[PDB]
Amino acid sequence: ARTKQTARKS
Amino acid sequence: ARTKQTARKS
Amino acid sequence: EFRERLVYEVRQKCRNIEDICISCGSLNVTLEHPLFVGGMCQNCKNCFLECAYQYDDDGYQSYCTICCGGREVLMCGNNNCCRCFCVECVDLLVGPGAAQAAIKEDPWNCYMCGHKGTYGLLRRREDWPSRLQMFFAPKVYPPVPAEKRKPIRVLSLFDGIATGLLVLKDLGIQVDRYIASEVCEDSITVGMVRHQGKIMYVGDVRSVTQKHIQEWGPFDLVIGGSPCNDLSIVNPARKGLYEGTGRLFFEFYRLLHDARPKEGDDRPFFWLFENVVAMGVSDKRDISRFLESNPVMIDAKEVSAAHRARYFWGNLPGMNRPLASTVNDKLELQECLEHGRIAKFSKVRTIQHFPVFMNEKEDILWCTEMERVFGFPVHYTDVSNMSRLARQRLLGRSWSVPVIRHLFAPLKEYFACV
Amino acid sequence: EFRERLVYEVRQKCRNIEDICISCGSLNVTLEHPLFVGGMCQNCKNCFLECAYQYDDDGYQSYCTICCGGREVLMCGNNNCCRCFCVECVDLLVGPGAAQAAIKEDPWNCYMCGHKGTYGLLRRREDWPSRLQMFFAKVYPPVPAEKRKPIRVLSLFDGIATGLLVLKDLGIQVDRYIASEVCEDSITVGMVRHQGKIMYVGDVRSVTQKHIQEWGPFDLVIGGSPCNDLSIVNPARKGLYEGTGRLFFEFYRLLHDARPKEGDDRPFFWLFENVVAMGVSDKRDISRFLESNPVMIDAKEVSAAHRARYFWGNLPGMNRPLASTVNDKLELQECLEHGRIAKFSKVRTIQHFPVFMNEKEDILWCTEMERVFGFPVHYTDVSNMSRLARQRLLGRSWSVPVIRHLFAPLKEYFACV
Amino acid sequence: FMFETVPVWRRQPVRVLSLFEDIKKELTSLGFLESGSDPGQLKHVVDVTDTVRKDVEEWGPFDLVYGATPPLGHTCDRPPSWYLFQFHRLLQYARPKPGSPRPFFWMFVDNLVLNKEDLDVASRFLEMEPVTIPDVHAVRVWSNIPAIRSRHWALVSEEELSLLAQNKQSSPTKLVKNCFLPLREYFKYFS
Amino acid sequence: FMFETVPVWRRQPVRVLSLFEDIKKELTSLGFLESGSDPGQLKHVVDVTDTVRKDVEEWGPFDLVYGATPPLGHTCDRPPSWYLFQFHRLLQYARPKPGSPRPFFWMFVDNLVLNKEDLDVASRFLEMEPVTIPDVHGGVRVWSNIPAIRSALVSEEELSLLAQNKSSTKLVKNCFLPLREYFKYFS
Ligand SMILES: Nc1ncnc2c1ncn2[C@@H]1O[C@H](CSCC[C@H](N)C(=O)O)[C@@H](O)[C@H]1O
Ligand SMILES: Nc1ncnc2c1ncn2[C@@H]1O[C@H](CSCC[C@H](N)C(=O)O)[C@@H](O)[C@H]1O
Ligand SMILES: [Zn+2]
Ligand SMILES: [Zn+2]
Ligand SMILES: [Zn+2]
Ligand SMILES: [Zn+2]
Ligand SMILES: [Zn+2]
Ligand SMILES: [Zn+2]
Description:
heterohexamer; A: 10 residues; mainly beta; C: 418 residues; 2 domains; seven-stranded mixed sheet; three-stranded antiparallel sheet; 14 helices; 15% strand; globular; binds zinc ion; transferase/transferase regulator; DNA methyltransferase
């Protein structure tokens, strides 16, 4: 499956 | 190394 | 990574999964997770409110569908589905190494999608649309399964510079039709150019008949914000809801009615009407009376660089939910300015008259800067030869793009993706 | 594919490589190939003129370095080098399968670069800079790829910074870009568009030789002074020696000041532009002072405007023919916004309203004018300047694809991004 | 005529929602309401401002919904459009759910109070042109009730009505009384 | 003073390029040119319009380059700036290649013909302010690298009126004196 990395918050 | 494809000409 | 021993004990048949918060592993279980089997603590519910319907520029969710956090996620292969699952969630509730198994599985289906519901101790809830419904808080539509979703059909009244269409695009929602009523040439122009002829422009909203509504084919979404000048209370010259352009409100009220599904037709349908918070009291009440609902108030400041407080009546999912700022957004006028110019304030005020310092001189906002304030892509209103005056006016009337993005986002769970 | 049988006889020591056109395998050998061993037919030379210095958006050559054609090419790994070699050329002159072997060779060097000068039946000529020079007709030899550095630029009467824009589009590294200008709107455009990088000085008449010296060596000096008092169709024209006409001479001064001394053989280039519609003694006097004659280039060939201009300078190959790359927009229609329709096929600026829009006769939209002039769309959407001001700014500027044509061979003398 | 005629013994007393004017009188006169004085079959509301759909639903089924602008002069607390919009709003609350074949009629009457823009708005919102019915020598009627045009009369150009309006002195109006006649096809007669 | 003084027996006759006015005889008067009538050591051109650097090179080495605007009234076929630009151009053609230590002098003289803007332009192109040397009994400008010209009130208003009145030229003869340091004297 495709994979990404999240944008950290606050 | 790297390879591309040319743009056909007028 | 704090729940591993708790979930260990969950599969050890020593702890109820429904007795644990499957999001953060808190023991402070209050709610049940709406999508899956397990408990939920309140803090995770708050997070879930801010985050669930946040999507990135790839059109996939910004964060994990379970924990509304997660550092690395698996995107979902199935068509029109946008969910993600962080590796970490999966390497617990499903089984260890299940994550890499989905990573390596080129045609992959997410657990909201796969035919059966068992995927370890993780199980999909059958009544979850209704629980989802309640979580965000009467005729309410359940979310359409990913494969059945289709392009949205849109009626947009008083369309202005086509903010609606822009946002739907930015969210990657497939748009079958976008009929728009407008009468201002400059705005029509902006729309025409910016969306490449796709908008079916009709004229005056007062020329749109029920027959028209019917033959312009079923609509999935009706939206609009009538002129506010005769409503806005700070205007000495007010004509009020029943005169001037105030009464254009009622045209929305008419056409919404015409566009609405009959009772017994349960197809998803959504509507959004916007106007200024600075109106009369009987005005606001009469609007609420006619749309049979009460407005939510949203201020752009939360998510843009303008003080812009507006009322929004409608039935979009989760429109009460808290407003979150994605990093793309530009809080502070400075973020919006051109180099060498400096911001007096941190937010522009439109519902010092010259908000900028440029080399000791006191300057107004540049149209490109104003575009940036309002959340529009820069140069969005650079289209014809209309005056600077006209381009200002156009941007003055429009919706704050990130506010509307917020309102439209959960429509993704009901319609088709690009 | 006409040369495969000829090359067999070339390697069989039955035909001289120097007796065949190594580009197309024509037997009509007239010239020698400037870069490599072999003959060249005239048609291929014409091609070589149009094509050699054509580069794509990747910053690599658009076509093969040998044949100036080729269907699939190998790009060059070495730094700052931009050449390509089609698989086909390689699969003959070097050896068979050498091409795919180079494809597979992750850090690869092209034959203009590789340590040795012989590479199969293909071997590099030693005097090739001079042959290159003469082919395109004090001259500087092309600097080896590893040695190249970022260009240093003096740009007088810079306008809306067309110079810098084109240098960026060609992917030429720019060390510095000092620019003289006096119009606030244009300065602004430049500032915004190139993100503060331009060092703005003021009036050209404030620029001293001392200044020229402390603003550090320049590799390229460019400019086009105001044409109003030069233009012959202007009744009120004041000519080369009065009005703004004399601003020409400031270019002439600063060029002199910026120029290297004899015995300093470092590459140096200059370009001055003005209108072809000038007086005769005017044009002669400019030629006298810059000690050269202008080339005339019209945008029409490559843009959608009739724009005929003189260009004095020493840029390589500036006599060479203009080619239209696919990116370019010939025809006003390609430049119009949808629902608008073009009367003419080219705009004319050195009826009065060139557009039909719903039965009425409309003027060009600034965004359309931008499209005509080769600028990226909205390039002059920057401040709160009037529509009049934005139009006038676009009125004065260089045709972007003409300047791209002029600046392109600088790539063989300076560093790449 | 859009509904099937009911057999007479099966017919039932009309139920009316009467919105600004009151038609209790002339509707009892024709025999539609029983002369026995009940509130019974007719509701009259005045300040609908806070009328909700649920209210209209609980004031029982309505077979006729009636509204009118207050006659010239006296009682215009609200602007003439307000009558049209508020009317329209409640009308939809009283409308039969689909698909109930039951007969449902409505009428809105201007007592010559709506100007030209207001007239256009009424006509677009009620999806028809009004019938103008005159005196001798003064009222406009929008309705789904059949055969309003059952009897033709004088032209009465808008200028006429305009001057008729102008006089507005000495400071109404059952010229509309006969229009309710075809309702006898579906509803009970009394006396 | 920028050059080393030459010993007298080693000194050689000045070579002069004289561009619009002619200095043949005040330079002969001072002993720089021999009164014997040669073309020899001085070249005088007038319409340089088609003068190329090759010409200046072939009219032999020049130790002094001189130019001046034609005096008021009569002879201005060309606009007053033209004299400065053409001068400046031929001057660079005449300049010694670097690094030739050889002494090289130049002078450009306005006979009160250049207005304020033209003056600014000259001063800027010749990289200096001019010395103004005046006409005296009851009541011209010079740019040069020759020493002690900068060695007489003359407000700009004075010159302005002086110019205006003059319908109806060598005060500059002495300026060439220091050239005797490097060049042969005659008589
Ligand atoms: N009769 C009419 N029919 C349709 N639109 C009208 C109208 N009268 C005014 N309008 C338009 O209604 C708009 C309301 S302002 C709302 C602008 C829009 N939301 C945006 O995002 O830009 C104005 O642009 C105005 O031109
Ligand atoms: N004294 C001065 N010093 C420097 N620039 C000047 C000047 N006087 C006028 N100019 C400028 O010279 C320009 C001439 S045309 C500029 C064209 C430019 N190549 C472009 O691409 O836009 C004008 O922009 C004008 O403002
Ligand atoms: Zn939790
Ligand atoms: Zn997770
Ligand atoms: Zn899925
Ligand atoms: Zn050939
Ligand atoms: Zn090739
Ligand atoms: Zn190379």
